Nucleic acid binder design. Sequence first.
DNA 1: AACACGAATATCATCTACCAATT
DNA 2: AATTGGTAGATGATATTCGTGTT
Lengths: 144, 144
Amino acid sequence: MRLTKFTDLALRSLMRLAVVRDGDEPLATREVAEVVGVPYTHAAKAITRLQHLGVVEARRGRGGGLTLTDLGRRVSVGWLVRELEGEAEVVDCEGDNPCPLRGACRLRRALRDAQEAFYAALDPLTVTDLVAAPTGPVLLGLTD
Amino acid sequence: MRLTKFTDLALRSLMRLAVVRDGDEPLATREVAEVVGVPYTHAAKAITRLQHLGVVEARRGRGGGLTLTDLGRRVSVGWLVRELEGEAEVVDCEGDNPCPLRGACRLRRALRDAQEAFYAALDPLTVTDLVAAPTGPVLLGLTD
DNA sequence: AACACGAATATCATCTACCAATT
DNA sequence: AATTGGTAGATGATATTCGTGTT
Ligand code: SF4
Ligand code: SF4
């Protein structure tokens, strides 16, 4: 059981954008992707996703890059992981070869509850929490 | 975020073995794999794993198949999912391209706690619970 | 001088098949 | 008449790339 590199990459991007100095300069996607150490092209897809979600402002030209939106700073990590991962079932009951235990599986209820426990354990935290010490100092130091 | 078909397949096998009538006849791996609808060869690897864990008795010849061990009926689903999935991190921080936020990532602590919440939501249930109504009746009906 | 949107290419983690060795 | 242990082919999900179209 593992989170997509898409989701973790997008959260890296959100954190980098969250440590930015208030009104220093908008960040180009390349510089964020290189600071957090991910391929630029994957980061750009994550940026388009985050922009659709409303957490990241992506100025498109004439001077301008990436800004953390008001929303971006107060949204919870649980909501972000739900929207970036897609809350898809933790098991593929109705795949190409569906399980005969559909419609009367207590394991499916159990795994439903466990996945909700995961997401709810993420639900309190915001992105400002994720960039508190010692993470914030590290991200800032990494800009050189 | 998805559970391996190995783990879900093995839990299907455990459930099928749990509904077996007390001293009816030991189950061949083929008949279990076909009742629960998984490829036989994958099921055999899961069976070897379960036997190493001590939950499944696999008589090797001269007449004999699969039995749920005393342990098998009282073990928790959380323990089973831990041993079959391997408690590997839900993110690959030290992969081929390690994250620069190792050693000072609050997201890693958050995801650690969320994964523990998952496993602990599974920790109460046993395998006898998973085959209670309506699952047990369905598994039994499926034997024809 | 950047971000967005859609079509492949690559990759790798697991799904799966298989042969030989017991028993 | 079955289960076990090591070896690759299969696969499909996603990690990644890229070209064109805005802006
Ligand atoms: S055993 Fe239950 S939870 Fe697992 S794949 Fe089948 S229906 Fe889904
Ligand atoms: S951002 Fe944190 S949790 Fe994510 S891969 Fe990097 S160190 Fe791990």
